[PDB]
């Protein structure tokens, strides 16, 4: 639980760093949990990244030739091996998502 | 809305077809709508592919390095372009999601 809450221009930082060579991402989409949506170590390269919103925030990666965006994002940390982790959870409408990025393969 | 309910055996076949080169997907969750977490025109190569369930459905794609998973589908169909769309919607949770698969990046 080394998750914070989101400092908006440390994120983007984050994300720009990144940005231009292959990394692998994990999006997720959790409810009441139960797993809806699920891709882990999708390789993408992004050329443009921005976070917005002024809490909770909303990411979008426009990949080579598509896009990856997640809304309710509302904690993050960088960990010990530099992986960008993001994550929000909604009480109230049982609502949970993560979108992580790293240069190297997500395992355990 | 040329959606169907899903036809377990006809989307296993479908899914096999795609398996082994390089394919489009798309997979989203939206919500009550919002969306929540997207990812279009990814490009993925998956070896293995599996519908599971009795309805709804979950599907699972193992590729090269990661996985797609997606639950709570529960319609489809294969267009005019051969283009596999699959789709659930809980009305009472109000969450829904959709995994579509193409040889061709998705447009309008």
Same mark, same amino acid.
């Given at each position: 639980?080394?998750?914070?809450?989101?400092?908006?221009?440390?994120?983007?930082?984050?994300?720009?760093?990144?940005?231009?060579?292959? $990394?692998?991402?994990?999006?997720?989409?959790?409810?009441?949990?139960? $797993? &809806?949506?699920?891709?882990?170590?999708?390789? $993408?390269?992004?050329?443009?990244?921005?976070?917005?919103?002024?809490?909770?925030?909303?990411?979008?990666?426009?990949?080579?030739?598509?896009?990856?965006?997640?809304?309710?994002?509302?904690?993050?940390? &960088?960990?010990?091996?530099?992986?960008?982790?993001?994550?929000?959870?909604?009480?109230?409408?049982?609502?949970?998502?993560?979108?992580?990025?790293?240069?190297?393969?997500?395992?355990?």
């Amino acid at each position: 639980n080394a998750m914070k809450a989101i400092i908006k221009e440390d994120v983007q930082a984050s994300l720009e760093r990144y940005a231009d060579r292959p $990394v692998y991402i994990h999006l997720e989409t959790t409810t009441g949990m139960t $797993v &809806v949506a699920y891709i882990r170590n999708a390789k $993408v390269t992004y050329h443009q990244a921005k976070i917005k919103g002024n809490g909770p925030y909303r990411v979008g990666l426009k990949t080579e030739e598509g896009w990856i965006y997640a809304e309710g994002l509302t904690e993050y940390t &960088v960990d010990e091996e530099n992986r960008l982790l993001m994550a929000g959870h909604l009480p109230g409408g049982k609502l949970a998502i993560s979108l992580q990025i790293s240069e190297k393969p997500f395992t355990v």
